[PDB]
Amino acid sequence: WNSEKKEFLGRTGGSWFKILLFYVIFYGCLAGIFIGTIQVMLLTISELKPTYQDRVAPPGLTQIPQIQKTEISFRPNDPKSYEAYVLNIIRFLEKYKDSAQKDDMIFEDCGSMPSEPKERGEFNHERGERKVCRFKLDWLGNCSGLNDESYGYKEGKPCIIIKLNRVLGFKPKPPKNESLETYPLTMKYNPNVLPVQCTGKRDEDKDKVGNIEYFGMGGFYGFPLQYYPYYGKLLQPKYLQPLLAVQFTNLTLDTEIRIECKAYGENIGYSEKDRFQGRFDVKIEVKS
Amino acid sequence: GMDLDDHRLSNTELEQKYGTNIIQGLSSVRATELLARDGPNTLTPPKQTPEIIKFLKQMVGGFSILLWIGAALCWIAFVIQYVNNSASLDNVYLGAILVLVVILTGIFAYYQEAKSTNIMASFSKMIPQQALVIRDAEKKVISAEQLVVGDVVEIKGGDQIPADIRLVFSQGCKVDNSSLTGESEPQARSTEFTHENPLETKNIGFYSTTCLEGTATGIVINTGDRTIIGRIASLASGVGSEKTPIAIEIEHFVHIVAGVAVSIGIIFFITAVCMKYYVLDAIIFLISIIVANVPEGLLATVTVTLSLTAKRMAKKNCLVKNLEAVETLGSTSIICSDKTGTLTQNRMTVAHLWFDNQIFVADTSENQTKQAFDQSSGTWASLSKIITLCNRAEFRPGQESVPIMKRTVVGDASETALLKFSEVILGDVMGIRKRNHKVAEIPFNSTNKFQLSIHETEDPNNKRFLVVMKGAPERILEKCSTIMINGQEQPLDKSSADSFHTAYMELGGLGERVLGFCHLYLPAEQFPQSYIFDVDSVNFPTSNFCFVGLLSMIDPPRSTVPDAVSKCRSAGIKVIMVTGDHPITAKAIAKSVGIISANNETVEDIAKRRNIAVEQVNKREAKAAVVTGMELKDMTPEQLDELLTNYQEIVFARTSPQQKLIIVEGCQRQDAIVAVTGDGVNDSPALKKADIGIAMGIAGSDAAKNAADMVLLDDNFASIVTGVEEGRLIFDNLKKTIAYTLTKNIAELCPFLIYIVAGLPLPIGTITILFIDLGTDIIPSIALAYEKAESDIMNRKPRHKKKDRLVNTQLAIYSYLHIGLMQALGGFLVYFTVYAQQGFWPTSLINLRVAWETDDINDLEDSYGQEWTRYQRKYLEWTGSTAFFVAIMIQQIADLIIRKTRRNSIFQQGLFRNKVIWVGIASQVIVALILSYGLGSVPALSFTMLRVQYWFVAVPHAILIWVYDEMRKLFIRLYPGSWWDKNMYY
Ligand SMILES: *[C@@H]1O[C@H](CO)[C@@H](O)[C@H](O)[C@H]1NC(C)=O
Ligand code: ALF
Ligand SMILES: [K+]
Ligand SMILES: [K+]
């Protein structure tokens, strides 16, 4: 480096200070503007209501076993075979014990028959948190009834739990009594239940699925409209969403059965691109 | 291949060397035996690589090194996708699209690097098919390819020379050495030693120069590629300049951008594996890194800017054989230039008339009747008579619709310039020649040196006798008594005696061949109209004539060459002349046409002025130099560089076709781009070696025209100044296009760089990037090519070949570190806004990619607690992809407006003045509209329809980018050269 006019690495010392100061101010300002624009963007969004609900507009549905690849295959002889399955159920259902629904400040008792959607609040910073409706475990008859082979969760002839994805400000509207939904219902109760009737995907398959029995609130095969709407996690603490058990006592063993459980509503839709929007997909095989 | 010729030796002395008899010829036995060792008499044709190899050679075309790795890794990831199944997969689709674009850009770069090495096309016309050889005392005509060193041949008049021949008998032989000198000025050949070196020894013929007249017996000294045209051909075809100076800059440019691609690829691959990622994950990271850095469309579009301006230059009569040639002109530094044909009209025409002891200037160009032809009106009235009467030259037929000067003539180079002069001045000289019928005829001889004719003037009544004699000026005063001034015939005096020689000496010192004219009206007393003049020089007098007038001929410069050379020199370009013509003509041509200034004096001029020895005076004080081809032999390469450096107005004369390459390589070893402008076979070897060669269209030999890179269709040396202008403009607009694509590449790269480190969900898919580079910016990228320079390029000097380059660290760090990062920050604002409107806040997106990409999870919670299905998250991810892609192009509308001007505000160039940049802006908006917010993005290609508010989220950063750019351009205008012009200029 020429000892003649400094110019280490091209440049003298004073100009070294000039260029680093320029780049520190360049990038510092550039970052100031980027985080600044982010903050002005975040002002528009409310902490309480999503600006848009375009994607989650059709509500999705998911099985509580939390199965790896849409599949449930086990041996009633081997405990480990279904060990992870029943563990996932127990983990989810821990929250619904009367044990946990103990505080009357945050938990209120909502009717044991379906009710009109409880409009608690308006989404403002007022009145603090909102009381969530209780859901008692016993309504999951024969599956986490707390006894009567509850602990097994139907180790033979399995049992799943159907859950409707939480969407904020969403009061679902069950289909009107236009015609027969499916088999002769004789189970109208139209206003306050989202009908959820598990069915056999494979029509050619003579639905070797066998008996299919749903355990709901007061024996109604749907979601009680009382719990809805959803005020968000911040407004509603541990909001216990409605849950519907399903016993599957199949007369077909060591054969894989594919079933699709659909939510029928005029406000609920389903799509062929999203096989977990409005629908299920369960492949259960009870190996020996 | 020997240039050690043998002209000193006598006939007896050579005949012992070549084992031949000058009269018995050679036995056909020794013909066979010598043909064996030496080979056939033929120029071996050049070696051209098959086009299939050149095409497939263009498949490692710089960027294709990284794109091959890209499609390799794509299919390698698909190999690992055999191990683990993936139905909806884009690594086969992406690998295919990549190989498609390697082959795509390859076939364009194939046309761009073109090489016409069709040199033998021109040489075949001149090579002779037959020879008049004599072997074993038997006259036979055989094919010239059978000749061998030292068999006798009988050169005939009007036939090409069969080989490089040394004459040993000659009777009025005159040959055409324009294939070595570029002049058709016949050099007559004796049979004896004239000069030391064999270029003009007057006793050796040359291969395939035409034999203008006479008969000469000779013995062949060299045959084949060792001949002088053989050596010219070896240099023109073998020294094939594949190196071009335009593509040395873009080759170095792909070196640096591939450099930065590779370096950040290993930086983030080692920090991938350090982050406990499987090599499969990290190599998908490398595929995205190289597709982000590589400017996909840059090189492809470049050849379209180049060929566009190639055909546009060709509509202005500048044919550009090689697409590269359009830049090679301009950013050039030294113009070595042939004179005749190129700087010269290559038509001997008259320029100066000396009558009444007074000097006059005439029409030299295609112009007509430009002179003070109205001074004496009586001396010039008879002077026209002697000019038109004393010529045997004639115009060829069918010339009623073709300009006078531009006409076909049969006759002598000297006589035909006077035919042209009399024909522009007096309408039909044939009329007055025919009228003033020529009764007496005189033969002409080479020793004669004068020509005379007696005509019976067809005046109605006068019908006297007029004798008119023209010839060398030396003879005229020797045989003249009464001069004429204004009709009256005044006798000569002591004054005019020396006056004639002094004027003549100064006129001939300007390279002008002088011819003097005298006449005499013979009295009717001695010779009436019945008296006839016998041709054997008995009846007419040869002394005591009447001097009419004097004139001179020069072969003038082309109409425009002086002014065009003025403008080249005034654009920082040193002009050198290189031609085969004697340095008396050359210096006058050179000082005329703007090559030598009027107060610049060679060593000759100063030694003549001071009347001191040339050894005494030094060298530096003379700013102009005239170096003969003969003193360049003894010249050493170090002192060729000495003089190239010391003086700036240098002309080389009587210079061998090999010394043209010697001088051009001498320039180029001084970091100087060179452009040699030529017309003849002697120029062709030095036309290849130039960084660009420029040939004359109609007035240029074929051999130069196939060696060239620009063929000037109308021999207009005024296309050079505009060719420089457009070349320097094309270079600056290439800088603009390049930096434009480079700055985008960063905002394409930052999403994957964050998605590897921070785990935010992929902000733009690797397949969507290709839509940016390959679709939206191809019309913007060509629309910058129509930009105009902020300041006149001519006011500035050429670029230094090495000192200032096409891409410099200032343009690179501006594009990558300044505008790329502002763009990517703008793109990420749209990313975070399109996630934060559906529930996923900024803060609560880190590390999510893992759960995000997990398809068993259909109930992911967002910041409002809603549950999300996989497919819904995947559609949102796609809307993040299109949000980010649209954001960057919106700031690419601003990028295109800042890149139009590298020096001053958009107001000064004018945003509206370029229409094509608005086609580019519109092309960008319309392609994104056809893509995202419309059909073709409903289910496909990582494309979703966008909320209308998402298009305009990126106008804040794209006003910011233009503002910041504009501010530094304002400050470089304001304070030039004070650390802002140095650190903040493209
Ligand atoms: C399921 O619940 C009903 C409740 O009345 C009970 O009668 C039935 O036995 C139960 N099934 C089994 C297998 O215990
Ligand atoms: F001036 Al030339 F060939 F045309 F030497
Ligand atoms: K790219
Ligand atoms: K060339």
Side-chain angles (χ1 to χ4, degrees):
Chain A
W1 309 120
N2 50 299
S3 307
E4 182 176 358
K5 206 58 181 181
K6 297 287 291 298
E7 289 173 2
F8 147 70
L9 213 55
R11 197 143 41 197
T12 172
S15 176
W16 268 117
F17 156 74
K18 265 185 166 62
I19 189 65
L20 290 178
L21 202 172
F22 170 78
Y23 268 66
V24 160
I25 288 191
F26 182 77
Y27 287 107
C29 296
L30 199 56
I33 307 189
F34 174 68
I35 72 181
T37 190
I38 287 292
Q39 277 181 349
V40 166
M41 180 253 301
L42 291 176
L43 301 179
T44 314
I45 66 99
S46 178
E47 46 176 358
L48 310 161
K49 186 177 184 55
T51 314
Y52 282 84
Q53 312 190 191
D54 195 20
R55 300 278 62 88
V56 76
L61 281 94
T62 172
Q63 55 276 327
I64 284 303
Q66 200 75 24
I67 62 199
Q68 206 81 14
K69 208 178 299 299
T70 78
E71 186 185 353
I72 318 188
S73 298
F74 57 83
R75 307 186 67 256
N77 184 227
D78 187 35
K80 183 189 169 299
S81 66
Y82 48 72
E83 181 188 358
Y85 291 135
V86 301
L87 269 282
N88 199 275
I89 312 180
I90 303 175
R91 160 183 284 269
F92 180 77
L93 286 181
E94 263 285 327
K95 194 172 31 183
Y96 290 78
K97 304 167 62 178
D98 199 16
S99 312
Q101 307 170 355
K102 184 186 60 179
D103 185 22
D104 284 19
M105 283 200 58
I106 48 183
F107 297 101
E108 53 176 357
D109 191 30
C110 298
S112 180
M113 290 292 177
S115 182
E116 188 257 338
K118 271 197 169 184
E119 197 166 351
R120 300 158 184 87
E122 192 49 49
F123 296 109
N124 299 340
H125 310 103
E126 318 302 318
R127 216 167 300 266
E129 286 191 4
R130 269 72 182 179
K131 299 194 292 177
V132 310
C133 277
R134 281 188 174 102
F135 185 105
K136 216 145 299 303
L137 284 178
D138 52 37
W139 295 325
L140 305 177
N142 289 341
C143 311
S144 192
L146 297 172
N147 242 0
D148 284 353
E149 209 186 358
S150 198
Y151 310 110
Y153 291 90
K154 291 207 173 70
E155 57 91 42
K157 316 307 169 60
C159 193
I160 69 174
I161 295 191
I162 283 194
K163 188 198 69 179
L164 191 102
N165 284 17
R166 290 190 303 265
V167 184
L168 198 146
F170 182 78
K171 335 176 75 173
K173 199 52 202 62
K176 299 305 295 175
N177 42 26
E178 188 181 10
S179 190
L180 259 60
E181 178 192 345
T182 167
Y183 57 92
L185 295 294
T186 83
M187 43 197 61
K188 293 173 55 64
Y189 208 88
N190 162 74
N192 295 319
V193 293
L194 285 176
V196 162
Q197 322 284 336
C198 284
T199 184
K201 170 178 170 296
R202 327 269 301 271
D203 292 346
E204 183 183 358
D205 162 39
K206 212 53 192 304
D207 292 349
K208 319 157 192 174
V209 67
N211 311 342
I212 43 185
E213 187 164 350
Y214 329 106
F215 297 97
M217 165 183 282
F220 290 105
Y221 304 160
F223 296 107
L225 258 59
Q226 38 191 36
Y227 295 86
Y228 298 101
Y230 181 50
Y231 287 89
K233 46 180 180 56
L234 178 67
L235 285 193
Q236 279 179 327
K238 314 120 186 177
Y239 163 72
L240 281 309
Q241 29 160 341
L243 304 178
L244 183 143
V246 174
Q247 157 175 317
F248 275 128
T249 51
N250 44 68
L251 281 80
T252 309
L253 290 321
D254 294 45
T255 308
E256 182 132 302
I257 312 175
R258 299 183 185 176
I259 47 186
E260 44 183 11
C261 307
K262 309 187 177 183
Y264 302 91
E266 41 185 340
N267 201 20
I268 304 191
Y270 31 72
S271 169
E272 296 180 358
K273 290 299 183 178
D274 196 6
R275 294 292 181 178
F276 279 82
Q277 162 199 325
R279 286 197 304 263
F280 261 46
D281 266 336
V282 187
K283 304 174 183 180
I284 52 166
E285 181 173 4
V286 191
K287 267 290 186 180
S288 302
Chain B
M2 47 275 301
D3 201 23
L4 61 93
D5 294 336
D6 45 288
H7 40 65
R8 161 256 160 181
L9 62 80
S10 187
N11 306 355
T12 312
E13 208 161 4
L14 53 89
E15 97 180 357
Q16 308 292 330
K17 164 193 177 187
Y18 291 98
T20 184
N21 287 332
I22 209 74
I23 196 97
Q24 289 100 15
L26 214 32
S27 63
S28 49
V29 187
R30 202 160 176 265
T32 57
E33 184 244 356
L34 288 195
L35 197 66
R37 52 146 199 177
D38 299 326
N41 180 30
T42 169
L43 312 94
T44 56
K47 183 208 65 59
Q48 197 159 3
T49 38
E51 300 281 340
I52 42 181
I53 302 190
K54 295 202 295 180
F55 163 76
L56 296 167
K57 178 58 193 173
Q58 284 282 352
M59 290 314 150
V60 168
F63 282 148
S64 305
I65 305 176
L66 302 177
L67 261 52
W68 280 133
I69 312 174
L73 282 178
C74 268
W75 283 332
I76 285 306
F78 168 65
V79 164
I80 321 292
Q81 281 171 340
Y82 276 116
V83 185
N84 315 88
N85 191 24
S86 63
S88 53
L89 83 171
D90 261 359
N91 286 345
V92 165
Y93 270 101
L94 186 67
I97 307 177
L98 287 182
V99 296
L100 170 69
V101 313
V102 183
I103 195 178
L104 185 64
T105 56
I107 67 185
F108 296 136
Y110 163 73
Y111 295 105
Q112 181 195 7
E113 194 170 5
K115 190 167 189 50
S116 173
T117 311
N118 312 342
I119 287 305
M120 293 302 179
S122 49
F123 282 78
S124 179
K125 313 180 181 189
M126 325 181 310
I127 296 307
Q129 306 163 353
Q130 297 181 14
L132 272 284
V133 66
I134 298 167
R135 302 191 194 275
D136 39 58
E138 288 181 1
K139 194 73 69 58
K140 273 306 172 183
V141 53
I142 77 173
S143 177
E145 313 175 15
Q146 202 189 347
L147 285 189
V148 74
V149 300
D151 48 18
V152 55
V153 181
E154 310 257 3
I155 198 55
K156 206 190 316 173
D159 73 333
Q160 310 269 330
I161 301 191
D164 264 0
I165 205 175
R166 153 99 163 92
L167 310 183
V168 283
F169 296 112
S170 77
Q171 186 64 34
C173 184
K174 312 178 67 62
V175 298
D176 185 23
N177 295 338
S178 65
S179 298
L180 295 103
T181 63
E183 280 93 38
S184 62
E185 187 67 24
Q187 270 85 31
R189 299 278 105 173
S190 68
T191 178
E192 36 199 358
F193 192 76
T194 295
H195 209 279
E196 300 279 339
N197 77 98
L199 259 60
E200 62 256 65
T201 319
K202 225 179 177 180
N203 62 8
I204 57 185
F206 291 96
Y207 192 3
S208 84
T209 62
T210 180
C211 177
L212 285 310
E213 90 161 12
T215 302
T217 306
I219 54 104
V220 168
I221 48 178
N222 266 334
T223 206
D225 269 321
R226 44 212 60 81
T227 60
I228 63 71
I229 47 154
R231 211 168 309 269
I232 284 177
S234 299
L235 299 161
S237 56
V239 188
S241 60
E242 185 189 357
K243 311 147 53 182
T244 167
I246 173 54
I248 67 147
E249 293 293 334
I250 79 183
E251 186 181 3
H252 159 264
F253 154 75
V254 308
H255 294 338
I256 80 148
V257 287
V260 298
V262 168
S263 78
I264 57 185
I266 65 186
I267 282 303
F268 284 91
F269 188 97
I270 70 184
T271 68
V273 295
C274 280
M275 271 188 296
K276 311 304 171 180
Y277 279 103
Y278 221 98
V279 285
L280 317 170
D281 315 332
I283 65 107
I284 202 51
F285 284 116
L286 253 68
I287 304 171
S288 309
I289 290 178
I290 58 196
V291 154
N293 288 117
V294 167
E296 267 80 38
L298 176 56
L299 252 56
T301 58
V302 157
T303 72
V304 153
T305 71
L306 294 192
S307 72
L308 179 105
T309 61
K311 295 313 161 189
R312 186 182 48 87
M313 283 218 304
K315 94 182 173 55
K316 306 174 184 185
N317 284 354
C318 209
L319 186 131
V320 185
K321 318 171 74 72
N322 308 352
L323 255 54
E324 301 150 334
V326 301
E327 200 278 320
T328 317
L329 184 56
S331 46
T332 201
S333 176
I334 309 184
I335 303 191
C336 298
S337 175
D338 194 41
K339 72 168 281 297
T340 42
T342 61
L343 260 62
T344 315
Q345 286 199 341
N346 214 356
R347 180 187 324 272
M348 181 66 56
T349 81
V350 306
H352 305 276
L353 318 167
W354 191 72
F355 51 94
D356 312 323
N357 293 14
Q358 200 71 33
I359 320 181
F360 301 88
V361 290
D363 60 300
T364 59
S365 180
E366 260 58 37
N367 299 354
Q368 63 215 0
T369 57
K370 190 266 148 188
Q371 182 225 336
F373 42 80
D374 297 330
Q375 289 290 328
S376 169
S377 90
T379 306
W380 176 84
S382 304
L383 175 141
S384 74
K385 299 181 185 304
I386 182 166
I387 294 183
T388 70
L389 294 178
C390 208
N391 295 0
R392 193 212 169 187
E394 293 182 5
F395 269 145
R396 297 193 190 270
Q399 305 220 95
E400 302 67 350
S401 56
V402 49
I404 294 163
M405 308 292 290
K406 296 180 174 178
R407 266 181 185 176
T408 45
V409 194
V410 46
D412 190 24
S414 302
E415 227 170 29
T416 53
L418 309 179
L419 206 160
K420 300 287 183 54
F421 179 61
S422 57
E423 195 82 7
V424 278
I425 292 204
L426 304 169
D428 47 288
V429 315
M430 297 312 173
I432 59 186
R433 287 183 197 189
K434 190 63 174 182
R435 285 178 61 259
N436 304 343
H437 170 255
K438 192 168 54 72
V439 71
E441 297 87 10
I442 278 176
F444 192 71
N445 194 27
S446 180
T447 69
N448 200 4
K449 301 303 182 187
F450 58 88
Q451 181 181 352
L452 184 146
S453 48
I454 289 101
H455 298 245
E456 35 185 25
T457 180
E458 216 195 19
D459 193 271
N461 201 17
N462 189 19
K463 284 305 301 296
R464 212 173 295 269
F465 269 163
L466 165 55
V467 80
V468 281
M469 173 163 67
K470 81 173 187 181
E474 293 98 334
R475 327 290 177 183
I476 302 307
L477 271 194
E478 177 189 359
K479 300 146 188 172
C480 171
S481 61
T482 179
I483 203 191
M484 176 185 45
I485 303 179
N486 209 343
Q488 323 164 9
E489 299 187 11
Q490 298 91 355
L492 280 173
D493 59 342
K494 197 223 69 59
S495 174
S496 306
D498 298 352
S499 300
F500 180 88
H501 179 260
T502 190
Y504 154 81
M505 183 58 65
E506 300 299 317
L507 200 54
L510 304 168
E512 282 115 35
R513 294 121 181 91
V514 186
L515 277 190
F517 291 86
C518 43
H519 84 298
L520 195 60
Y521 285 87
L522 299 175
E525 312 290 333
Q526 323 157 355
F527 297 114
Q529 293 89 28
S530 176
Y531 274 32
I532 56 177
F533 308 93
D534 302 348
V535 198
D536 56 6
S537 192
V538 299
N539 211 61
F540 34 74
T542 62
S543 288
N544 304 354
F545 267 72
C546 164
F547 177 71
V548 186
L550 186 76
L551 45 75
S552 66
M553 302 148 295
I554 187 54
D555 190 353
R558 299 199 150 269
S559 307
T560 183
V561 73
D563 311 332
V565 172
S566 175
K567 300 182 179 184
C568 283
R569 291 195 57 92
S570 185
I573 299 186
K574 178 216 200 86
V575 175
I576 297 186
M577 190 176 59
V578 200
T579 182
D581 217 351
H582 302 85
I584 38 162
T585 306
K587 67 97 195 172
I589 290 297
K591 59 99 181 174
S592 305
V593 304
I595 290 194
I596 298 183
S597 201
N599 290 355
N600 286 2
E601 298 185 359
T602 175
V603 283
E604 312 144 10
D605 296 352
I606 65 186
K608 173 187 175 302
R609 268 194 37 88
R610 305 301 186 94
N611 287 132
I612 315 286
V614 54
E615 178 71 29
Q616 307 289 328
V617 49
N618 307 345
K619 303 172 184 178
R620 225 282 310 173
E621 65 277 57
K623 307 180 63 64
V626 182
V627 174
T628 77
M630 200 62 187
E631 57 212 44
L632 215 166
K633 255 300 178 176
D634 309 337
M635 195 161 303
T636 193
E638 192 179 7
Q639 56 198 193
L640 216 170
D641 298 356
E642 162 189 327
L643 78 92
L644 289 187
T645 48
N646 289 357
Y647 324 111
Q648 61 278 338
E649 309 174 348
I650 324 184
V651 291
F652 286 67
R654 293 250 87 182
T655 187
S656 73
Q658 293 87 20
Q659 275 177 2
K660 288 175 171 281
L661 284 146
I662 270 73
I663 205 177
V664 70
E665 299 164 358
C667 298
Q668 293 180 25
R669 69 200 285 183
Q670 293 183 171
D671 307 335
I673 307 94
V674 288
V676 289
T677 88
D679 71 321
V681 194
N682 53 348
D683 299 285
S684 62
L687 271 163
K688 284 304 292 177
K689 183 59 190 177
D691 303 273
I692 180 180
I694 307 177
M696 297 301 146
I698 320 164
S701 301
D702 291 25
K705 290 197 299 183
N706 303 338
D709 298 74
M710 278 195 322
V711 182
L712 297 180
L713 317 170
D714 49 2
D715 305 349
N716 199 19
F717 209 88
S719 302
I720 310 301
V721 55
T722 62
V724 196
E725 174 181 348
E726 302 188 27
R728 292 142 98 108
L729 181 53
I730 281 176
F731 182 85
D732 297 4
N733 292 347
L734 278 178
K735 305 183 72 75
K736 305 180 180 183
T737 294
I738 281 192
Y740 167 86
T741 66
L742 303 184
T743 179
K744 187 164 30 191
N745 293 338
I746 290 306
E748 297 160 4
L749 171 72
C750 290
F752 314 106
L753 204 149
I754 295 313
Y755 162 71
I756 164 166
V757 289
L760 305 186
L762 200 44
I764 45 186
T766 309
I767 180 182
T768 63
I769 304 285
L770 279 88
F771 284 85
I772 328 170
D773 306 304
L774 283 184
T776 84
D777 305 83
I778 58 177
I779 313 101
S781 157
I782 312 164
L784 279 189
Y786 292 77
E787 268 300 311
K788 302 294 296 181
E790 209 85 28
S791 61
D792 183 26
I793 319 283
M794 305 290 105
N795 301 349
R796 319 176 309 104
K797 284 78 193 175
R799 82 169 184 94
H800 193 270
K801 195 169 177 298
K802 309 162 52 182
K803 288 176 190 174
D804 46 13
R805 296 195 64 92
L806 183 55
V807 290
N808 41 36
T809 62
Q810 203 52 250
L811 187 141
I813 69 180
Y814 193 85
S815 206
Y816 285 176
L817 268 72
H818 283 180
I819 303 303
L821 265 70
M822 306 179 67
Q823 287 187 0
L825 261 46
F828 263 106
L829 159 75
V830 195
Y831 168 87
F832 285 127
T833 206
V834 51
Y835 279 65
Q837 284 189 359
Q838 299 281 343
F840 282 90
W841 289 339
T843 180
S844 201
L845 269 167
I846 317 284
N847 290 343
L848 201 47
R849 62 163 289 269
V850 54
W852 190 267
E853 296 161 355
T854 320
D855 40 17
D856 317 334
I857 309 185
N858 290 281
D859 44 9
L860 180 57
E861 306 176 9
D862 62 276
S863 312
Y864 301 106
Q866 309 167 160
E867 285 174 332
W868 278 71
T869 312
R870 168 74 206 275
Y871 186 81
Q872 306 302 339
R873 296 178 306 185
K874 155 172 299 180
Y875 194 98
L876 175 61
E877 182 181 4
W878 291 343
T879 312
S881 191
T882 50
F884 208 107
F885 150 81
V886 196
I888 67 107
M889 65 81 45
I890 298 288
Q891 304 170 81
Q892 282 290 141
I893 299 284
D895 187 44
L896 195 69
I897 308 177
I898 81 176
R899 245 76 187 184
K900 79 148 48 194
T901 43
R902 297 192 303 108
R903 192 60 177 84
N904 209 29
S905 299
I906 69 151
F907 313 106
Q908 327 289 139
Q909 205 73 31
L911 58 144
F912 277 110
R913 315 312 102 81
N914 208 4
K915 175 257 306 177
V916 71
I917 68 105
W918 276 107
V919 175
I921 285 180
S923 90
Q924 225 162 11
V925 175
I926 66 182
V927 60
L929 277 175
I930 296 172
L931 261 52
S932 173
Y933 199 8
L935 303 174
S937 88
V938 187
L941 283 318
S942 300
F943 267 93
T944 58
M945 290 171 297
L946 265 180
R947 284 299 198 265
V948 61
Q949 47 173 2
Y950 289 152
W951 286 78
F952 313 100
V953 190
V955 180
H957 285 262
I959 304 298
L960 165 75
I961 169 170
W962 172 71
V963 160
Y964 163 69
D965 173 84
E966 212 77 0
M967 286 310 292
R968 52 149 278 264
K969 279 187 316 191
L970 176 66
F971 274 84
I972 64 180
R973 188 184 190 91
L974 258 47
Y975 311 111
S978 294
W979 179 86
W980 203 270
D981 204 19
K982 303 177 173 174
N983 297 32
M984 318 290 169
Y985 176 68
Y986 287 91

